[PDB]
Structures are given as C-alpha cells and as structure tokens.
C-alpha cells in the first residue's frame, strides 16, 4: 500500500489527499519525540520510543502551546498565523508530503516555522506542503519545536531546563528524517533545511552547530538569521529571564530546582500571560524566551564561529522581503494603525527609535536618527513612517543577513541571495505595510497556483518560479536549471556581492543589498555603542 | 581741490585714477595708526599722531609681514593673493575710492582681506576698489591689520602681547572710517564692513564684540563666519603656540617678559620662518596665530553670546562657494596635484578625513568617513576626490556659517544668503577644484567689466548684479530694488531659511543650505566627540 510506510519508530498510514487535479500522500502527526510533559518540561527532548501496530498519520498534531495574537479578532491577515489546531504541550510530530506514485530517493526539504520563538505551527495553510511536494517531485517535511518558556527558558548550569531544548526539538526532527526519509522515498544525503524569520535563524543555526552539521545537506534562510540580534541572548540575560518568569508567578526563587519545580507545576497559560513581563527594554522585535549562547549548541560567540568558518559548509540560498519592519510597528510603535495610512510625526518618529533600538545610548539614538532623517523633509510624515520601516527592517533582519552572508560566503560552497519585492494583490493588510514580513511564504509554499484564492497570473508565474528555484537549489546547491534558456541567478561572491530582486517583473541583477545602511548597523553603530 | 581732503589727522592729497572711460579719486596708503614697530610689536595698536602738511596719498602702502606662498611660482592663481608691495612691520594703512564728483554723503563699504589671519594684503589687483566705488556710487574703503604672529600672538595676561591686536588695527580702521568718512563724502551712519574668509570671520567678529559694534552699521561675510573652526583658539592654546614659537628660535622662555623680549629682537622673516611649527596636529585649514577667547575683545565663549544675543542687531548678507575646500586639498592633502584631475584612491580619501578634522577620535573619523562615503561605489576617485572637498568646504566653512546664520537670525533685522556656484571661466587653476573658495571676490569687485581680462558677457552681467546686490543692501540693509521687475531675493528667516544661487543662471531660490551635511557637523559630531 502507498500510504502505508514501515520506519524504524513503526509502521505509519496516511493519507491521500487532492492536489491541483491530482493527488499525493501526506502522513500527518508523525511523532518524533516522547511527548515533552510534566517533568519532562524544559528538558532536552527525548527519542520518540517506537510503537507496535499502525501509527494513524491522517490527522495534522496539536500546535505547541504558545501566545496566540488576538490583536484584530476575526482578521485573516493575523489569525493565519495563529494556531489552527489544539495547542498541547504534546507537539512534537512532522509532516511528511509524498509524490504518487512514492519515489525511491527524492531531494527532501524539510520546513522549519518562524514565530520569533515564540509562537509558530506547522500545520498552518500556508505551510501545506502539497503545492510544493506535487509541482517539484520533493519529499516535504515540516516539522515542529517548542516555543516560549517551554522551548527557550534557560537556566545554564541545570539540566532539567538548559535552554535551547526547542533547537534540540528541530534537532531530533532532522535526525529522524535522516533515519527514515529512506522509507517515504526520499533521499537523507539531499537534504534541505529551510525556514522563515525564527525558522531562518534556526536554520543558521543548525549550519553553526558541530551537533547539527551532519543531518542535512543545504540550507535556505527567509528573512532571518543566526546573528538577528533578538535569535539569542547571553546565558546571564538567559537566567535573568527565567528568574523574572518566577518571579511572576510567585515562585520559590532560592535554588534553579526550586524554580524550575514551580514553573513545571504551572498550566501552559500561566506561564504565556506572564512571558512578556521578562523583556528588559521596552522595546519591539524582542522575544522573551530565545536560544542562549550556551558553550554547548554554539561552542562559543556566533561573531567568533563565523569569523573563524567554524560552521558547515556547503551552499546557501538566502534573502530577505522590502518591507521587513513593518509589523512590528503596527504592533508596538506609537502611530501606527491597521486602517490608517500610519502618517507618522516627527515626535512618534522619535520613539520609533527608541523602541527600535533598545540597547541604545542617546548618542546611538541620535546616529540612528541621523542616518534615516531627510532634513530637508524632517516632517514628512509618509518618509518618517517609511524610515522606521526601514530601521526595524534593517536592523533585526536586513542587516544581520548580509552580516552573515558576507561572512558565510568566504568559507561556504557557493551563495545565492533574493530581494523579494512583490506585494501580494490579494492582501489584506493596508498599504503602508508594503512587501510584509513572511508574505514571501505563501509564494514559496505555491498558494498561489490555487485559483480560489484569487492572485494574478503573474503572481502564479512568480511562484512555479520561486518554487523551481528552491527545489533545484535543494536538489542540486543551484537554483538554476543547467542548459535553459531563462535568466540567470548568479552566485553571490565576497568580491562582486550580487543578488536578484524576486518579483513578477523581469529578473534584474543588482549589488551590495542596503549596503550603505548594513555598514552603519554592522560597522559603524556598534563600535559607537561599544566606544561610549 | 578735488584730490585734497582735510581730515582730523591732517591733510591728504589724492590721485585721479581711470576706471571704465572715466576716472575717480584715490586716497591710497593713508595711516591710521602708529607703525607698530619696535616694543610696539605684538602691542595694541596705537592712534596715528597728526601730521603737519599734506599726506601723499597716490600709492599703495606696504603690506603687512607674512608669509608668501611658493608653492607654484609665476602661477598668477596663487601669485595674484601674494604681497604685490614691499612687505613690512610699518603697514597700518587704509585706502578709500571716492566717486567723481566728490559726494557729500554717500554709501560706505569697508573692506577686510582674508588670508586666514596669517596672510593678505588691501593693495591686491582682485580689492581694487575703482570699479565698485565708480558703479554703484559707494566710498569704498579697504583697511589692513597685522596677520600672523605680529597680530595674533597671545599671551593672555601680559599687557605687551595680549592676543587679538589684529582685530584691534581693524577696529581702529573703523574708528578712522567712522571718524573722518564725511571728510571724502561718506556717511559714516552707512558704513558696511565686508570681507572674505578670514575677513568674513572678522566681520562676524566686529558683530560680537561690544567695542566695535558701534563702529559700523551692517555686514557682509563671505565664506566666512566668527565661528570657523580655524578662526579662534583659546587662551592656553595660544599661549601654548606663543610659547612654541618661542622654543622655536631658541628663546629664554621663563618668563613673558622673557619670552616676548626675545620674539621682539628678532627679523620678522624669523618669525615666519618657523610659524608653521606651533600647529598641535597635523591639519588642514588650521592657521597657527589667530584670534583668542580672552574676556575681553569676545566678552565670552562665541557660542553662549550667539546663544544669548549678545551681539550687534542689524541686517546682513552672507555666503558661500559651492567648493570651499578645493584649495586646502590640493596645498595639503595626498593625492591631490595641480596639473592632475585629482582622482583620490581609498587610502589617500583616509588620510584626507585625518588632515581634516585634526580634533577628531577614531569613532569621530569612522563618522565623517560613512557620512560622506558612497558604499555601493567607495573605490570611484572622483567621488572621493569631491567628498573629501565636500569634508573639508562643510566643516570649515559652510556649517559653521549656516550655524551663525541660524543663531544670528533669531535676534537680528534681516538676513541674505547666497550659495555662489558659478565657475569663472578665466581660471586658471584647474576643473576638480570647481568654484574655488576665493573666486566670488573678482565679482564682487567687478574685474569682469575690465574687458582686458577675458569674462564673459554673461560674467559681466553677474559681478553687475552682485555689485549692485552688495551696495544696496549696504545702502538700504536690502539688496533688492524697491518697486522693481527683477526677480526678488528673499529674506532668511528662522522658519523657511532661503537662499538664492548666484550665478549666470535666472535666479533660483532654494530652503535649508546644505542641511543634511550641516546637521552632522553642527549637532551629531559634536555631541559625538564630547561623549567619547
Ligand atoms: C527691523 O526692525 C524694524 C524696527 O526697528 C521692524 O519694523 C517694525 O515692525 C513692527 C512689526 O511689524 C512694527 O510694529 C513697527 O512699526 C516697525 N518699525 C518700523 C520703524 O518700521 C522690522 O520688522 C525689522 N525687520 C526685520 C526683517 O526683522
Ligand atoms: C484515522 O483518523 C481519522 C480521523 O480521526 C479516521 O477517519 C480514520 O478512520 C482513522 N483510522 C484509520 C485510517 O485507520
Ligand atoms: C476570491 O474572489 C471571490 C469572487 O470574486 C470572493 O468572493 C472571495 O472573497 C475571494 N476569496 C478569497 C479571498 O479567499
Ligand atoms: C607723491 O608720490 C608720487 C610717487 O612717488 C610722486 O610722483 C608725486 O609727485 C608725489 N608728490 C605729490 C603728488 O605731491
Ligand atoms: C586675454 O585674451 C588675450 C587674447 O586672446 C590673451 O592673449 C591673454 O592672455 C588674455 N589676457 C589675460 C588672461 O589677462
Ligand atoms: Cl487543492
Ligand atoms: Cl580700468
């Protein structure tokens, strides 16, 4: 039978399901490790132990638990990201997608969620990984890590709560693979990891880690990096948190057991309603609960790891969307609204930075301002709203990409970076957002080659060609079809530094991506911060 | 007699002077003060004593000691700013144009040389005051003043070398203007002081300081404001450089006394000699002895009394050439030649910014490197070439300008700036220095209507139009024609700062002169260096 599958955790059944005029298998709420619950919370995950009968793999699992953003109730633009299922501390399944008739050994792509570490799914709509699986003859997986507290709190020097266990989770998940794909028909010496934001950051940080390096074979990063400056934080800053979580639930904070007991006595709710007291700054694009800079996951800094080529090497393909800040200041910044044009004033602009930068000094405020003031124009309010734009993009994604793929590129096997500027004609968030954080998902995972959900032609054009990218990439560490007569995305190299945009337009080649505003936040900006 | 005058200092005798087909008088080389010769050197300037008899006044006086440049001999672009008189200590001097018929109380305009206090002479072929006093009907008087150490050595303290006497001989050439103008036709009630560069930093001078600011009725500054960052020091850096010039021509150095007795029994070329030597960094644009904060000709700081008002109220006019640090490069800067285009390598844009902001920490270097650095381009010659005259025309001139301007406005009667950006197209230095700081003043005297020298008509109607400008805003504080078809030049007002350009071009008017530069040098930088 196709949809039944004999690994070596058991034997799994699942399912067929419709696909544009055709069909494929999908085997749903694979479980890869034992469920993470009652003591088991904050520790490193645990080997799934194997079952005896038939896994019904029909069904997508509960989602983590997780914040869940009820910022504009009813709202497709933010519900589609929320949890679209039970959430349950036990999450820890995968989804696999499988061409029909099953191949025998197909490049695989395994799916790794954003969330900004806190939140995420893998069995959201736009995470299905059927279009993808049927149109490029790929083996999909998408798996699944805890978020929040139960993911990330981090008390080094425990081993009941470590930090980083939901990175182990990611871990566990590629391990699997790499021990059973062979069974559905895919390749685990082809494999690629890819993800979003969080999931991109995750990405690079399983090229960072020696305890990941050997269970996939590339990498494609989406709007996120391991250097982001809110993917990690020190294990001082690790602890702090952790002891303020306590805090808030009026935990014994005299030993790491007596803290870890308390919060392991707490519902999962308990801890997601206190989570966000924990940030140090007011601040946005800041997570609570995040991976730690531990000595063991990273052996030492990201900064010396990529300096010294102390990560994987191999072929990456990477980049970013225009508009990369503009969520997080609909969300926190003062003059931002979802119905408005967002017009924003010279004094909004003003605390725009303050939150977009927390770490700041008022000398590094000031640069900041600066560097994205039009003094000509200071009062502009569409330029004030599109500088912070701009600031939040360049500084949390932007910026520590092109850190990283300039570094990455001295060691690495061959580069290639987008610029993906198409905004969506069917989205539902206003205008000012421009080219949104993650709206680059829906074209990778080929939503629009569904006619009912209404894009363009060309916006379905666009798609079969993002797709066709990132499966020949995974299948081959290019992304372009050797002896074709299309446009060619070149290698990024340390000299010439090019990119493509990823738009319905001809392809254009362009070099050094935001160059002058990477050299203030990258160069210029922390030697500023570190002299002062 | 038409040539005669009889003043409160005796009796002068003047010369017929062609200029444009018809002829005016000339009362060149009259003294204002005694020679300040002897002890008298580095001393206050003293009153002449009145003389029996008639002055002969039919030629130019000696200039003043300096140094002469060299740097290309028998060029006249660098030859035409060097003494054309015997130099010597003996140079308190004026020299007044008077229209024919003698008026009875007409528009004066006092001149006052740059030089960067450490040169310049009134008797130069491009002051000659014929052609202004002829055409627009105005007394025109050029003063002179001590440069150099015989000016500007200051030790603060002592009654025999207390700084500022330079100003002091100005001050007292306005005293003489103020006291014996009526005597040649002029009204003394209508005086205008104007002058370039360090005589734009005087003019700005003679507005702060309470003893001279009855002495005039409105200002002109070109290139120039008291503010500069070359134009003052304080009273330990001057003693500090009294004191090397000292060590220098190897003086007794335990006292004053000591020290200013030993400067005074030396040849003035020995002083010049080694004058260079007392600078404390390796710079551009820095002038060894200049004016001094002492307490007394500026009662306090420059920036408080602008801050403060503490300052004559009246009207002025004021600007800038769009390429004031061409000059400085090509005398200083590696990389930069006179028979080159100048195309300046990354290295040689580095050692630039080095040589022209000497005052600055690494940081404060990294800042003014990315402020003026196009990064998708750093390797293109010309662009570091124009960046580095940018660097150099914004710090030392134009921001401190726009500065002054900017507090000046708040308190005072009314403001004209002007952006001159015409390139004469005589010149004989070469293109990549552009509108040379420097290069305004030919027009400004209204050498172009001399046919002899090879402008342009459309020159010639520019330096008509500037010289009918500067003398109606010295006549009315206006330079407009009242009830006029030409196109206006606005006032500067704190709200909508406009400027115009002048050059061959219809008049443009323009908002915010070179802000963005401006706001860097002027707010960023300096709370940058403070801080670090
Ligand atoms: C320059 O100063 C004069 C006064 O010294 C100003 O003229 C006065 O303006 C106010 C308000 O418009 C009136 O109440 C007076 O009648 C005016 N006085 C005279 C004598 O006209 C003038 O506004 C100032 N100009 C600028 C540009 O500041
Ligand atoms: C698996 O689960 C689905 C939904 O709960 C159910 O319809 C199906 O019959 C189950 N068992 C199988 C396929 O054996
Ligand atoms: C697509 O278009 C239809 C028909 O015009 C519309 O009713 C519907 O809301 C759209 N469907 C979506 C956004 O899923
Ligand atoms: C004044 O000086 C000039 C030049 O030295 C001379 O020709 C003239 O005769 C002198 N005396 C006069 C005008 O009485
Ligand atoms: C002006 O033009 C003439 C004739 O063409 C030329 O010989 C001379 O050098 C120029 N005069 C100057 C620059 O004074
Ligand atoms: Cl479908
Ligand atoms: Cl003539």
Same mark, same amino acid.
């Given at each position: 039978?196709?949809?039944?599958?004999?690994?070596?955790?058991?034997?799994?059944?699942?399912?067929?399901?419709?696909?544009?005029?055709?069909?494929?298998?999908?085997?749903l709420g694979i479980?890869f490790?034992?469920?993470?619950?009652?003591?088991?919370?904050?520790?490193?995950?645990?080997?799934?132990?194997?079952?005896?009968?038939?896994?019904?793999?029909?069904?997508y699992p509960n989602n983590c638990?997780q914040?869940?953003?009820?910022?504009?109730?009813?709202?497709?633009?933010?519900?589609?990201?929320?949890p679209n299922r039970?959430?349950?501390?036990?999450c820890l399944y995968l989804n696999i997608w499988?061409?029909?008739?099953?191949?025998?050994?197909?490049?695989?792509?395994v799916w790794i969620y954003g969330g900004?570490?806190?939140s995420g799914s893998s069995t959201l709509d736009v995470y299905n990984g059927?279009?993808?699986?049927?149109?490029?003859?790929?083996?999909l997986v998408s798996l699944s890590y805890?978020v929040?507290?139960?993911?990330?709190?981090?008390?080094?020097?425990?081993?009941?709560?470590?930090?980083?266990?939901?990175?182990?989770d990611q871990?566990?998940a590629?391990?699997?693979?790499?021990?059973?794909?062979?069974?559905?028909?895919?390749?685990?010496?082809?494999?690629?990891?890819?993800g979003?934001?969080?999931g991109?950051?995750?990405?690079?940080?399983?090229?960072?880690?020696?305890?990941?390096?050997?269970?996939?074979?590339?990498?494609?990063?989406?709007?996120?990096?391991?250097?982001?400056?809110?993917?990690?934080?020190?294990?001082?800053?690790?602890?702090?948190?952790?002891?303020?979580?306590?805090?808030?639930?009026?935990?014994?904070?005299?030993?790491?057991?007596?803290?870890?007991?308390?919060?392991?006595?707490?519902?999962?709710?308990?801890?997601?309603?206190?989570?966000?007291?924990?940030?140090?700054?007011?601040?946005?694009?800041?997570?609570?609960?995040?991976?730690?800079?531990?000595?063991?996951?990273?052996?030492?800094?990201?900064?010396?790891?990529?300096?010294?080529?102390?990560?994987?090497?191999?072929?990456?393909?990477?980049?970013?969307?225009?508009?990369?800040?503009?969520? #997080?200041?609909?969300? *926190?910044? +003062?003059?931002?609204?979802?119905?408005? !044009? $967002? =017009?924003?004033?010279?004094?909004?602009?003003?605390?725009?930075?303050?939150?977009?930068?927390?770490?700041?000094?008022?000398?590094?405020?000031?640069?900041?301002?600066?560097?994205?003031?039009?003094?000509?124009?200071?009062?502009?309010?569409?330029?004030?709203?599109?500088?912070?734009?701009?600031?939040?993009?360049?500084?949390?994604?932007?910026?520590?990409?092109?850190?990283?793929?300039?570094?990455?590129?001295?060691?690495?096997?061959?580069?290639?970076?987008?610029?993906?500027?198409?905004?969506?004609?069917?989205?539902?968030?206003?205008?000012?957002?421009?080219?949104?954080?993650?709206?680059?998902?829906?074209?990778?995972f080929?939503?629009?080659?569904?006619?009912?959900?209404?894009?363009?032609?060309?916006?379905?054009?666009?798609?079969?060609?993002?797709?066709?990218?990132?499966?020949? #990439?995974?299948?081959? *560490?290019? +992304?372009?079809?050797?002896?074709?007569? !299309? $446009? =060619?995305?070149?290698?990024?190299?340390?000299?010439?530094?090019?990119?493509?945009?990823?738009?319905?337009?001809?392809?254009?080649?362009?070099?050094?991506?935001?160059?002058?505003?990477?050299?203030?936040?990258?160069?210029?900006?922390?030697?500023?911060?570190?002299?002062?």
């Amino acid at each position: 039978s196709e949809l039944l599958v004999n690994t070596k955790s058991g034997k799994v059944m699942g399912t067929r399901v419709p696909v544009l005029s055709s069909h494929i298998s999908a085997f749903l709420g694979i479980p890869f490790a034992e469920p993470p619950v009652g003591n088991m919370r904050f520790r490193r995950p645990e080997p799934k132990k194997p079952w005896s009968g038939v896994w019904n793999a029909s069904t997508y699992p509960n989602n983590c638990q997780q914040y869940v953003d009820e910022q504009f109730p009813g709202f497709s633009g933010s519900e589609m990201w929320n949890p679209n299922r039970e959430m349950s501390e036990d999450c820890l399944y995968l989804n696999i997608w499988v061409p029909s008739p099953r191949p025998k050994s197909t490049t695989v792509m395994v799916w790794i969620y954003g969330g900004g570490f806190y939140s995420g799914s893998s069995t959201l709509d736009v995470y299905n990984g059927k279009y993808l699986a049927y149109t490029e003859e790929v083996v999909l997986v998408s798996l699944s890590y805890r978020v929040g507290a139960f993911g990330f709190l981090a008390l080094h020097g425990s081993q009941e709560a470590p930090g980083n266990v939901g990175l182990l989770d990611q871990r566990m998940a590629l391990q699997w693979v790499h021990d059973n794909i062979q069974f559905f028909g895919g390749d685990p010496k082809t494999v690629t990891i890819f993800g979003e934001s969080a999931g991109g950051a995750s990405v690079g940080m399983h090229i960072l880690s020696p305890g990941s390096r050997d269970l996939f074979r590339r990498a494609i990063l989406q709007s996120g990096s391991p250097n982001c400056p809110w993917a990690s934080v020190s294990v001082a800053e690790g602890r702090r948190r952790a002891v303020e979580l306590g805090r808030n639930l009026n935990c014994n904070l005299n030993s790491d057991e007596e803290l870890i007991h308390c919060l392991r006595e707490k519902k999962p709710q308990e801890l997601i309603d206190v989570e966000w007291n924990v940030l140090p700054f007011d601040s946005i694009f800041r997570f609570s609960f995040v991976p730690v800079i531990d000595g063991e996951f990273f052996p030492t800094s990201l900064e010396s790891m990529l300096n010294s080529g102390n990560f994987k090497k191999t072929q990456i393909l990477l980049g970013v969307n225009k508009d990369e800040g503009s969520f #997080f200041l609909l969300y *926190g910044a +003062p003059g931002f609204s979802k119905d408005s !044009e $967002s =017009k924003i004033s010279r004094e909004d602009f003003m605390s725009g930075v303050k939150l977009s930068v927390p770490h700041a000094n008022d000398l590094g405020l000031d640069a900041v301002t600066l560097q994205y003031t039009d003094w000509m124009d200071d009062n502009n309010g569409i330029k004030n709203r599109d500088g912070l734009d701009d600031i939040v993009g360049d500084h949390n994604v932007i910026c520590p990409l092109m850190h990283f793929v300039n570094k990455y590129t001295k060691f690495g096997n061959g580069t290639y970076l987008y610029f993906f500027n198409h905004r969506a004609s069917n989205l539902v968030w206003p205008e000012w957002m421009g080219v949104i954080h993650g709206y680059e998902i829906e074209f990778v995972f080929g939503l629009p080659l569904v006619k009912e959900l209404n894009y363009t032609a060309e916006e379905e054009a666009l798609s079969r060609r993002i797709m066709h990218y990132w499966a020949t #990439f995974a299948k081959t *560490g290019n +992304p372009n079809e050797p002896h074709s007569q !299309e $446009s =060619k995305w070149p290698l990024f190299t340390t000299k010439e530094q090019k990119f493509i945009d990823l738009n319905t337009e001809p392809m254009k080649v362009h070099q050094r991506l935001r160059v002058q505003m990477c050299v203030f936040w990258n160069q210029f900006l922390p030697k500023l911060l570190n002299a002062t």
